[PDB]
A paper describes a structure:
MKLP2 (Kif20A), a kinesin-6 family motor, is involved at several key stages of cell division, and in particular is essential for cytokinesis in mammals. Kinesin-6s are particularly intriguing in this context because they are up to ~40% larger than the canonical Kin1 motor domain due to a number of unique loop insertions. To address the deficit in molecular understanding of the MKLP2 mechanism, we have determined cryo-EM reconstructions and calculated atomic models of MT-bound MKLP2 in different nucleotide states.
Transition to the MKLP2-MD-ADP.AlFx structure causes substantial local rearrangements in the vicinity of the active site (right), which are in turn linked to large subdomain rearrangements compared to the ADP-to-NN transition. There is also connectivity between the N-terminal end of helix-α4 and loop9, while the proximity of loop9 and loop11 is consistent with a ‘phosphate tube’ structure as seen in other ATP/ADP.Pi-like kinesin structures. Overall, the compactness of the ATPase site is consistent with adoption of a catalytically competent conformation, similar to that seen in other kinesins, highlighting mechanochemical conservation within the superfamily with respect to closure of the active site to enable ATP hydrolysis. MKLP2’s Switch I/II subdomain also contains a 5 aa insertion in loop8, which is only well ordered in the presence of ADP.AlFx, and reaches across to contact H10-β9 of the neighbouring protofilament within the MT. Thus, although subdomain rearrangement results in reorientation of the MKLP2-MD neck-linker towards the MT plus end – as with other plus end kinesins – the docking of the neck linker that is typically seen does not occur in MKLP2-MD. The higher resolution of the ADP.AlFx reconstruction facilitates the characterisation of density corresponding to loop6, which emerges from the side of the motor domain facing the MT plus end.
Residue numbers in the entry:
A (entry chain B): 2 to 44, 47 to 360, 369 to 437
B (entry chain C): 61 to 190, 296 to 391, 398 to 508
C (entry chain A): 2 to 34, 61 to 439
The structure:
Amino acid sequence: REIVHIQAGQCGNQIGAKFWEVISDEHGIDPTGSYHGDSDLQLERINVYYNEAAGNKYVPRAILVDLEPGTMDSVRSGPFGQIFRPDNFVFGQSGAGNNWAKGHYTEGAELVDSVLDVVRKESESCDCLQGFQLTHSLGGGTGSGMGTLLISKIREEYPDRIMNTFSVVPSPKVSDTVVEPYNATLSVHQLVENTDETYCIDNEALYDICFRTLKLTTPTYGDLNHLVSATMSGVTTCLRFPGQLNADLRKLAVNMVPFPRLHFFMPGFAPLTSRGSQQYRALTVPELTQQMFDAKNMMAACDPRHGRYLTVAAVFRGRMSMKEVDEQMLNVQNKNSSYFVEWIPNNVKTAVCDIPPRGLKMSATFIGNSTAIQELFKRISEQFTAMFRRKAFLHWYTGEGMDEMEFTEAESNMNDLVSEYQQYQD
Amino acid sequence: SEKVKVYLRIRPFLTSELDRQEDQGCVCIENTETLVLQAPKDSFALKSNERGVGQATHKFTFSQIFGPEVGQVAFFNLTMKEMVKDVLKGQNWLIYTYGVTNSGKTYTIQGTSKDAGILPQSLALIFNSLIRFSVWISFFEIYNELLYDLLEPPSHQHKRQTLRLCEDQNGNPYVKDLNWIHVRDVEEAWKLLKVGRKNQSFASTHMNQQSSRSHSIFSIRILHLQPKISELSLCDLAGSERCKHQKSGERLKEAGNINTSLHTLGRCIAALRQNQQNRSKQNLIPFRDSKLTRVFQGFFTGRGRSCMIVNVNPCASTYDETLHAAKFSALASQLVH
Amino acid sequence: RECISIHVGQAGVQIGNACWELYCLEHGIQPDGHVPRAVFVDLEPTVIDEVRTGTYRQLFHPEQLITGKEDAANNYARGHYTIGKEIIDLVLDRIRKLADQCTGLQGFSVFHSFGGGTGSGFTSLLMERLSVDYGKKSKLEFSIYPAPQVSTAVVEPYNSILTTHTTLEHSDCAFMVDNEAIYDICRRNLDIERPTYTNLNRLIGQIVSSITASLRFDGALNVDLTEFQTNLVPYPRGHFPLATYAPVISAEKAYHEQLSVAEITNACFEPANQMVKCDPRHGKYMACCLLYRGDVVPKDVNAAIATIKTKRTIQFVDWCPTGFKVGINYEPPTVVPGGDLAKVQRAVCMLSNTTAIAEAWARLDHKFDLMYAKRAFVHWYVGEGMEEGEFSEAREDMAALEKDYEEVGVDS
Ligand SMILES: CC(=O)O[C@H]1C(=O)[C@@]2(C)[C@H]([C@H](OC(=O)c3ccccc3)[C@]3(O)C[C@H](OC(=O)[C@H](O)[C@@H](NC(=O)c4ccccc4)c4ccccc4)C(C)=C1C3(C)C)[C@]1(OC(C)=O)CO[C@@H]1C[C@@H]2O
Ligand SMILES: Nc1nc2c(ncn2[C@@H]2O[C@H](COP(=O)(O)OP(=O)(O)OP(=O)(O)O)[C@@H](O)[C@H]2O)c(=O)[nH]1
Ligand SMILES: Nc1nc2c(ncn2[C@@H]2O[C@H](COP(=O)(O)OP(=O)(O)O)[C@@H](O)[C@H]2O)c(=O)[nH]1
Ligand SMILES: Nc1ncnc2c1ncn2[C@@H]1O[C@H](COP(=O)(O)OP(=O)(O)O)[C@@H](O)[C@H]1O
Ligand code: ALF
Ligand SMILES: [Mg+2]
């Protein structure tokens, strides 16, 4: 079961570079080096994210799409940046405007054809393809825009394979852009009708969780990103290893998404203790559930406690007894029966791998599908409408060949999506 | 508003079908409006004697029911004349055929050369029913949940691309990216149907060779200025199938896609009937769930008078699928336009 | 006389390696020792490969190891229709070549874990095509039914209501072991809060060794496989009896080994040792097969059972006078060299059919229903070549098994 990562846009690229920086380490794959892997088990499944060509050069199977040179020209000129095959670099020297429509209809539309070519060359790699990974930001052109096209085409060329998407939703408190809510509403629309697994990350939730769960005084982007890359490896990659109870994308999805819409999840790491001090090593198991299921520690901005849960996926990865896990999970579902849905006897879906993160003893990826994520689409819709009404920076969209009813479409869709989420939140 | 016009028809057992297995008397007729059912089978459902295929009785309620003996001409008499008049009136109208595999839905829709179907008959009636007139035709097929335009010229490889289903200024969803041809005469429409046949996907099944892979939607919009806009749409949906067990391969995938799409209509109607009973602050409409449901939204929830053609298979094996279909129609009858 | 075994599904394959392990252990057949007589099928390579990488690697033939690189899918539908179909062919072929190669076999011991993907789907179509190609044989399947409250899969019940409908009308006798109730045994009858799947498997792998293995071996009261289905099922329905083990003492904590028959047999009827959360809340026994092995005197037995029969608290069904199949084997049990099992010189592996399952079924029926009421993950089944038929026609179906265990019992 192979897969093909996709670093759409600037953010998606920056974060992507960190995800591969991480992932490689969990497979002993040096820049241009070969398999230095501490063990031999970190090789039995490499195929899934790499490619066999020479015999010492296992190249990551990802795609780099962006209309801004600077990005691709900084990631390929650094560390592991020199591992990607030139063919993978799908750049577009055009005008990388921060406009969703400009990167989906005018500038993005051209490089798209030059994308489909590669996305087909990589899909036809080997073994059996499972799905595609897509990373990007809902606060820019090449991210929300170019990324919104890539999915609509991918999910039409292979409506069989799954589609995981890691989006960096526009943080509330402070928005790192001005058109932000526009590019968001417009991209979420296509996502909720293409991708079948979306992990919303919050630039401001990262800061928080990195300022209170990590004594880090200077949380650089690289850091933030790294945290994400650590969680997103626990999702996919992890499950591609043996284990007492192993899972995989399919199992994971067909167990977490009750309604065809797509549903949004919430990534969460387990052992999140500061280096020096904090190193209590308290990882028996009950300490992990305490963390993960807490408010703080949830990559989303909204708090689970503000909305029922639909499903949960405990992706553990560390030698442990199937008793102290499955039991605990139950206890938690009883202690917090209030918000955890009743029409579902067993919301939590326990998974237990074996091999842990290289230097750590035991970890556990958290993927919660709570209806609490409503307090995000609402936010966006608010900010959107609030400026839409006055057609704020609307002329910047239309002028790139768009429709004024298109904005309505997006809003409507995402708004209806809110309805559904509430129909099962009560 | 009025309840959806629904008619139930059954197809006669084929000689080959009869030879394979002969179990008749499953469907009986009582009154033109209603059907009485007693179905025989090799074995009944294993439980206390309840609704089984072995020997059981059931009741069907519909506007009108047709026997195995008569074909499309009977449908043309009652349905074709009145339905076309509504469209001329400017009122939107839509008719589709629903039923299990081997029900002969293509027979109702297209019809044979000797016996013209609903579409060719309605085409004749529109002229009779018919001031400036403008008319265009759109023809497309949905295969593997992807849309193709029948109008597209014949070629080795050709894809229309995904249908641009975007809601415009109008609240009701509209289908775009469809090529349109002016309708001067019936023959022009017929020609479009003929060329469309080649483009439309076809396949053979254990049940029947005629089997259509893709659902077919024929849409004709008439604009008349004494401009009134009216849309007449005739849809030929593919039926459900056991063939999935019998065959595999691409055929399995096509069946899976159809069975999922067919189910979305069923869930929608179920919600719709429930919506009919419940006053408010209840379950939402599944239109958004599937693309097919979205397009059909106007049909189910919004504007336009609707009529449905349900085909039934007298086969005992098919009984569970047919019962569900009948149940679907019964539930659909509950809600009003 | 022979019998083959089909380990299907991640769990069923993991448990298979365990159950098959104990075998060699009491047969003097080291890692690279004869040719077995079972197979391992799963749509998850990583799990089947574990038998190609871990212990007993070369003790199996790569021909009796079927794998489907595609997708496993934790759902009946996919495993049954779409994918599972593609694999069935190859699978059947093997269980038809090995069934021929032997000499007068007895049946196919199926090993699946009800609420799984390959365990639900796959098996369903396997047993179907089996009952037609070998209707004239025995079909005893040892299943692992969904834990009453500590389930795993979110869909779990769905996958078990679809596999029940097809197994009811194709299998002869399906033994069931409650996954949850196994932890209990490790806590109350072993004392250990660290039970890994590889441990739970050792339990089943033990009771089963007393089923097939030791039974197929001569003794003072041989018991053929046919005997079972005959004396264990009162009606054509694929009745699901319960598996139980007696000498489950810890080889560390307590040490009372020397526990005369009368006691080891009495420890089988106690709810805190029945390898199933089907507590005798009302379920009347209707046939029990007390399989003994080791030092056991036929008279000592024909007394310990008599005392039980007159204990009244074990209330048997009305229409059943005597329902106690005394099975005496020779070879005593076989504890893993360094597991956690005491190691006695006699054991009582009592299995039986009890109207108790009325509970277990209800609790799984309700579950299913609750979810079905909103259709939840139904679209995940439909899109894999399925419909409301398989569901609605299997809901009402099993229903008549909830009524069956009520009608055929509770009434004089
Ligand atoms: C001496 C020692 O034990 O050091 C630990 C350590 O101190 C701690 C604090 C690590 C440390 O992580 C961070 O400080 C951190 C920095 C930015 C963003 C997020 C986290 C560590 O850097 C991270 C590192 O993680 C790994 O090695 C995992 O395999 C992890 N790898 C990466 O994220 C990675 C980092 C750089 C380059 C390549 C990969 C991983 C996790 C999930 C999935 C795949 C890989 C570990 C255990 C440590 C250090 C080195 C100090 C912690 O994080 C992780 C992800 O394990 C932070 O809280 C945990 C608890 C650990 O004990
Ligand atoms: N006793 C025991 N139970 C197990 C073991 N492995 C899994 N289970 C149980 O069986 C069920 C898990 O089934 P899965 O592993 O998800 O699936 P599968 O049946 O192998 O097939 P797929 O869904 O297609 O992967 C859960 O109820 C587990 O608690 C095991 O080794 N021993
Ligand atoms: N976590 C994270 N967010 C980023 C990074 N880069 C940009 N972002 C976020 O992405 C949004 C801006 O979109 P951007 O990536 O510039 O769009 P594009 O480059 O035109 O596709 C802001 O909300 C930023 O916080 C990054 O490296 N990590
Ligand atoms: N009312 C009918 N009378 C006679 N033959 C019919 C009738 N309905 C269907 N058939 C025949 O049954 C076969 C299958 O019908 P068809 O319409 O193609 O199937 P489907 O319902 O799946 O669209 C054809 O050979 C058709 O001519
Ligand atoms: F022609 Al059919 F289902 F067989 F629509
Ligand atoms: Mg598995």
